[model samples]
Target: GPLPFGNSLLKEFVLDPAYRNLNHGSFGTIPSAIQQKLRSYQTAAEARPCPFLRYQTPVLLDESRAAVANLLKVPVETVVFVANATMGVNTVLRNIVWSADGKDEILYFDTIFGACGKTIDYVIEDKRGIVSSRCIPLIYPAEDDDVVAAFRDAIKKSREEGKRPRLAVIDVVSSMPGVRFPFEDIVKICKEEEIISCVDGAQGIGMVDLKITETDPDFLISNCHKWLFTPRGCAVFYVPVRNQHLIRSTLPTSHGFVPQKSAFVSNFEFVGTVDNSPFFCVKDAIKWREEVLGGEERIMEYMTKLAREGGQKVAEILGTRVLENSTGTLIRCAMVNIALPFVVGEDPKAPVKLTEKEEKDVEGLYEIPHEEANMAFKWMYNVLQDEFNTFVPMTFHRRRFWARLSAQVYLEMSDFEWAGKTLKELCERVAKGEYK
Candidate 1:
């Protein structure tokens, strides 16, 4: 049967109601049905340890890879499984030979996802290579054109120095502010410069529409567990057929003394002694998402619409504008970067400042002290949770200060409206310094 009216279905899974949960950019919650299925797989693995490990494991692993390839619209041979995006990056960086001049550089923007930025730094330092990073200015309501220009300027600078920048690390969708990047343009620039582009799609996978074949990045890495709702520790890495030879196992000696005849899988799979179940669950996760939402396109369209609606509501409550308002939906996946009223310092060199008064004011709104806000937020958040349950009902959780809403098939507008109302009340209390 067609799932109950979309709103009713949403109310069933998303538990909290009062505060519009707008932060699905972080970790995502899995549906109970999917969770149960994953548990069954785990139980089966435990039932017959030896045979399952030797035979069933490999078969399921291949299925998982194939399913992910199907979802991303790429070839199965081009994809490899890894514990997470971090491991996938390490596997690629570990094998590359930096240029001898010590000027061969890798460039990344400040907005680069945290782990990836750190990984780039490590690779440069360890190999005595040059790495340059520039922070992108946080211009409120900036456009994709502004971002593309900045990146292009950086690439041009490197070319002028007579040293070819070997690589550029970018995010398909940034993790912190949750902005969807101009990946197509960035990839084009990289191609013109003959530079390899690696995208950190840690927040991509099921959350957005990705056509790996169309994008043509040299490397792409994403987590299934985050948006795809797979069990934790599941991720996929895609390497173009030509670049597969450039990667070696993060653990080079474990799977065998030699590489798998297949370049793509051999590069990452040989990493020694790790739990392989997470990768096996990828196919199940894809299936669960499809079954629950009716189909892939319908699910993506529904979540995208909900996120846009919820994000706009949250932005209004916060008294701040969302980045790229006109293009918000086009550039956004499942997450929205809800800017807080607080601003980082205007001085580029200075550290971000939050006055004690401002901090205290923001902290004063909850029933519990700032130290216990997560618990208090949960209470306030439950207002929306309960309403959603009674009306549109969906299950979701809040982080320390923000409610990250998941728009799986089981969420509705009432959930967002409840969230918006709660946030307005909380902000009012904060402005009044209610806690102090």
Candidate 2:
């Protein structure tokens, strides 16, 4: 019943033994069993294309929806599968009816994902002066209370500037810095402030406790691929019954869009012709997680512990530290950000003021000129994969580079050690102007 985690269970995954997948947050790797399940569904579709796609697929889709909904602890009717979090967020933002008064604003943090931020930008541009956006500045390792306070301040400022904060994009765990966001508190504030909350949980689900029903966000979408061990381009989008009416149509408005009969479930039942195998595999992935991986609770606990402990080890090896707040809540999830023993540029205007210990930590760290940051960034990625046979996503945050490492059931402290040693060696080469 209990499958040992770490390298013992590495065989369950399809990852190359020669390569270590330390960047599971980017695009997740599916387990070998789930891969087989996905292929079986794909093979079945070829046997009877029409019957499977038109008829049988909906049945399987419903089952997958129910499985994910059950896991999120929300009603099955509130949950549906989307291609990804970006598409789901796009569906909500695009379908919303902007006010004619031209004072509505979309509020989001600076840590918002690139694509989702671009979606907000596009919506603002497409709306033709009807809507605008407000970005709340956030520096990493921020306390949860401070994050919530910043949201409240932004809301007050929006109203003061004669703008209605219509909807806010919140992240369960933000990208770039890859730290757990204070989504629960911010979502609560959104409700009290009467602002619609659209939670971007692209780095959520399976790795953290969602408490979806309890939070009661206006809309929430999480990538099953990134953390739930599903195939790429699969996400579970949740919209309560109350807000379903606002989502008039899906992206690319397919045949499912019925004018006479508006429905959320049928609206997304089919959206163009793409492989729906990933959507169907949601059920099998959950089942595999339960049977082979013990369960979600066990898996999340292991990964979170690994990320925190492993991140600390990496930081120690590099003589830096894991990016965290005084409360240590930043690394509450399965991903941790560790300073890369290098500074991009010293910013006197940085948001989060460093403590004495933090100041001493990066005192003698190599400072890469802002101009050469991109070149060195590309070099680190290139050498990590080319030489070390591993990949850990590095992010530029607050004038320094922080390596974001994801911990999974298949990864252990040894992998983190390997990451530390590799990054240290890489940084040493960079210090010698090897990128030039």
Candidate 3:
């Protein structure tokens, strides 16, 4: 049965009939209205290419930008749509000219998204004398001051070593840990330290409140599909007016070949003849959040409470600390990270009723080598799903691991209650060596 919070909105979303999906943070679920709206727009584009793509679609895209910008509280011109945040990050990362001298570098956190990590690797390594990158430690359960301090130290260290720290890409909410990040302070550090700041807000805006007016970043990119109510493969990229010159077309380089005043807009306006339906669908997504679905605030409020409560429950069951304080940072809401290396049933929860040495010989209830942590995670995850029909993401972070859970308008605490109970039972079974 669906819960009563925030319209429950379960029926509104065309989610799979089977399985309790607890992993909406990685990808978002679209409302039925949005799905229909997207279909309509796509059909219109196919039926009448000239009017739809050149004229009406462009007009609709402008309105979509206005709607999305309104949702983000940013100026319409400051935001443009991309395929997703990875593309947003790639567009920003590769677009900028990097001097390959080891002295010229970009700084990112150790916890950057995996694909983005590889992108950085490829880009930096591709050009011998372009940009180098430094990894800043933002330890789980970290402080804003600590992050700021790291940036300060890293930049100074780079300069001391005769390297220039040019740019920093950070997440507003970490993908693996699901904790709200100290982006405000990080951006501040970048500004003072003369580093260009790029934000991967894939989990920022919808999962949490992102008031761009206050904690500003020179560049911010996010996927609307993840948290905001929109179709998949749609994201918004924002460039501060001052930094607009850095904007460039994505990998393919659309019709932005012309040297024009609106190059930034032209760069993203058309990225080849692909389906522009996702960008056009943004208007309905915003509408679904506000008008049809009863305001985004209610959704945020409901999901925020659920995340806090859910994180606490998961932590309680696992005997671990959440990677974040409930209501942790200025933008911390929805996603919760519970500290990990939490094992299910590897050791006895109560007095062992039967098998002793074998059970004792079973892996201790502690952190295995973090490298092999995924092996244990796979077992536990499969048990949770093959048996419980529930989903929760288990991740390795901070030399340990944590089960990062996301709370959405479609999820409720009863699900959390069940997850907690099921996880404890699974732990007990493992302690008994049921799997091994």
Candidate 4:
């Protein structure tokens, strides 16, 4: 159905109106227009697998890849489809061998997604004797220069230790903090250092204005299913022409293996007879954003503006704060952090009393264990879902319970204002032992 006339932009998405969604940073919800297009591809594929799989899928993959390349400002041949950004990280890291030079280290940031971090760990573990990894934590009150300096120091240390830093994986919009990075400088650093710079653009590509050709990070990957709002598991994997030799098959023995074509494309195109509907849908997804929603400029401006202001409102409501740094506004687009009163992890099954003394004792408990934290957060999330019909991602970064709000076109400031008030009331209730 077309959006109800005179309704807010929120109507475009198929999200239940009853649910106030401030969690776009998590798995994104799809709009009906694009989903309809998605199903059409599925229907066609199922209706005639031979023509669709052998011919249509590959043809459209290139076309969709071209569309995304235009958005990324990179060459069409450089980009290929992947399941998610994590796959991109793995594809890059797994394919490239450690430097034979005693200096074979992988350097990355503390703000990386858990899956990405784990992939780096797992792959490096396979070659542990040959390569090591260094985690450089984003500084307290960090800025672009601070980030650049951290990388410089990390590289120097690797060199000093007689190890060559082979690759540096950085994030455009880091996963947890949802903070934007000074990626251009970081990429330049890698270029000067003469190493691979792989960008995890899971939270970046669609939300910001990225000229990959200009910035020219050696490799890049981003998920369209996230902020781009396509069906899940759709991502772009980019490797420039110069670095294609670094390619290795994700499942080198998959059916698509061929010696004749570029190893880069062969490795990714058919990792199995997997559903390629998501790839076919990327072009439409971009169209939906530009034609159905609005132009990229309009979308970025509206969403970023809303996120910046709404996060502040949510923060002030909880008597907490958002990041205030030199690049705070520039780095962030639609994701904002709101502080909560207590550290994460509590007895979700048992009611947490709203008394100050208990909270102190709770805090004194050195925070709850990870399992307990997950149980506690799952319970709190349910309260938001079943009780308030609201959606927000919660985190325990830096010993604080932060409500990460991800805004999209369908949302506005007032929605977040309401979310904050609701959260505040619930946190107050939780503190006062308000669980029933």
Candidate 5:
């Protein structure tokens, strides 16, 4: 019953054919069918105005609530939609009552998203240093066991410093490097340590299986638009019944705030609405993914396999390597990061000093001066779009730059092949100081 994938599926999406959408992780493009589905709801809302927006919209919104709840394997009451994951995170961080002791501290990883990291900083400043934050540093290519061990160390260190590690913002799958995080292990650790786990799954939901019930956390938020084929900027924010009481209000505190009447769900049903059409489209998106793409598991399997195999293809072509660890856990999701042939360094002429751990991966790679790295980075992005007619996001880690490529149902091996060749040619240009 499932349709074939790859170029054949491209016609169903709304992307421009000339521009290869190799970066599906940054922002997902919905199917043409779902676009029409989205427009139908908009037209109805426009036609009825007050009738639909006041009374009918809430009823229809519940249908979407039910659909996504089923997909996430959580209760409909515990799940709600916000504009994006950042808003979901803001709602949680803002609502929490910081302890009066001044020893309470938030915890996050070194790879935390820029905005989420800023949110943590703002929370600490807003709380007047009564609450603090600690960052758990990470080195890639390390095993899951090592990562979990570092988390335990952080907790022990926090206690030694007489600081109460109140909560940790975990990632379902980290952005930037675009790798799957060991969130389940971290969540278990949080439970044992009595640290509230605030999961920032901004890169989650559609790309991988969350197994939410099995890995329950105090708070979780994932962007639906990124990989779920929804409209721009929609996210699923989840908090279990046990922890719902902690969230006293929404971001803006809408009319749904009744002090005590069904506070959790009602608080988010409407939040000063701009466009409710995207929220209403959740059910339709799920339907399209099911009836058209043959359902969630099928879609995930295809994309994960494609990302893994396609990443290796790109790495092979570049004579570089995909960012992965032992036991093959990093690329479990549909996005993969492959090291490019160039490294960033302080001196343009001297080879970058490599630690024993980094030497093997980046040896013989061309070195770009740290001062000029941004110029080259920006050039790669521009040339990839302007000349190659494609876009693959790049990130710098440990002196080397890596490209993050996303795999979706509409993309296949051939697209990755094109990406590999494109990057190869681009890197060659960098070797010749073309970016200068």
Candidate 6:
């Protein structure tokens, strides 16, 4: 049964009409109304160059922050806008002197985003700080108690070894597996351990119901463009009032650098000469999401429902189990991962080998480049229109292939069905050694 298109207005903004677009978790498409609003703001800024840059920009920035704070239930002064989450992470990490006392070590879980992992690596290897990591095994529908215990044990061990974990980074929603972590409990653990908690909520914003104050993380960073439907380059970083002084602005030469008789907004606001329009447009993005989609609660409900439905469809098609049995409106967002079937035992012992016939057969079915075979397999597993679409190939882990799927407003169940059918056919072909 087809439901009336509730998000028809949202659909008009999307530029890509071809292929069943399902990958909204990576980077979301902006709504048409928000795009128009962004243009209006940009045009106005260009029209009045002096006042816009000197006076209005600061005021508008404050207003945008206030708006975001209102939605996230945090103090306005605590939230700082940035270009993206990466900048947010770097800003927090770079400002701290981990080795100042010579006993600081940064801790992170294995599921942290790749970019954040690199940032942690730099802090350790490049900056000469101690680092420890605990790999949290992938569990579907993650049990909060188990996760909390694992983290507590890790922290206890770190303290016992005299490493004294100073900073810990956790993702509110894992980018790779699309798992929503128990961030609240994790932050609580950090508090008890006297460790600074930095939350990478890159995939969180509009997708999850978050109250920043409640989470009480020492530092939080999120990208507005991914889930909030903001234009590219809009993101935010929040530091508790107590830690605000620690964040020195990234751009040293900006007006914020001049020790103000009264604190100048530019000190924190200036990040060199570049268009601040995208960041400024966050106000409109939030407004459009609220007004056009019938408020934040409704918007999340719609998106989460879409994700769960798509996840179930994908899991059924792949003949794999979901990480969680029940994905409710509040639990699931616009992203889902589908596990793919893989051979056990002998295949895991020996490297997978394809016969000549297998190679020729795969080559005949799809004209995928040699470099993209794995990516293609993954794509075919998630995308329905594989014959014409471009996507990443399937990946193998523990003798099993898995592909992740994402669902946005524009996606329907047919897309997942298509992906499932394509994956099934591909698996059959591989079993026959068509790609050998």
For model 1 the local lDDT of residue 228 reads 81
**Residue by residue across 1-436, what tens digits does model 6's lDDT show?**
2222333543657565555455677767787777787788788879998788778877888878878888888877788788788888988887776655667777777777778888877766667644444454543345767777878877888778777778888888877667677788889888987889988899878878766877788899998888888888878787887887767656334656544212423456666766787777788878766665667776677667766776677678766654553433223666766655444223333554654533342343323234445654544454444464634233343334445666655556666677677666666565554544
lDDT of 4 by residue, 1-436 (tens): 2222112765566878777777877788788888888889999989988988888877888878889888777777788898888777887878787767545888998888899899888987787767788899774336778788988999888888878888888788876667777888888999999878998888876788766888888888888888777788888887889887767556435765555446667567678778788788888888777776666777777778778888888888877777546656433677877767666454456544445533463444234444455656677788898989877776665545767787777776778888889988877765554443
Per-prediction TM-score: 0.80, 0.96, 0.88, 0.88, 0.97, 0.83
Instruction: Give the Cα error of residue 223 in candidate 4, in Å.
Output: 0.4
TM-score, candidate 5, is 0.97
lDDT of 1 by residue, 123-167 (tens): 767876454444444332447777788887777777787767778
Which stretches of model 5 miss by more than 4 angstroms?
259-261, 347-353
- Local error of candidate 6 at residue 347 (angstroms): 8.8
Worst 10 residues of 3 by lDDT: 345-354
Question: What total of clashing residue pairs does each candidate reach?
Answer: 25, 0, 12, 7, 0, 19
Please give, for residues 1-436, the per-residue lDDT of candidate 3 as tens digits. 2235532657778876667778889877787888898899888888988888887866877888989898889888788888888888888887787654556788988888999989889987777556777888665566766777877898888888788989899788888777777788888888887788888888876767776778788889888888887888888888888887866456577677555425676667778777877788888877767766557787788888888888788778766556653346622678777654243332333332323532342335643443444556677788878888777786654344566777888778777766667766776665454554
lDDT of each: 0.64, 0.89, 0.74, 0.76, 0.89, 0.68
RMSD to true structure for each model, in Å: 6.4, 1.9, 6.0, 5.2, 2.0, 6.1
Candidate 2, residues 1-436: lDDT per residue as tens digits? 8699998888888889899889998989898888888999989999999988999988999999989999888889999889999899999899999888999999999988899999999988897879999999986679988898898899999999999999999999888888988899989988988889999998898899999978999999999999899999899999999999888889879987768523789889888988998999999999889998899999999999999999999999999889899998899889998888777755445544666766776687778877788999998889988999888887777667899999999989999999899889999999988988
Q: Which of 2 and 4 is ahead in lDDT? A: 2
Q: What is the number of residue pairs that collide in model 5?
A: 0
Clashing pairs in 2: none
Show model 2 residue runs off by greater than 4 Å: 260-262, 346-359
Please give the distance, in angstroms, between residue 343's alpha carbon in candidate 4 and its true position after superposition. Answer: 5.3
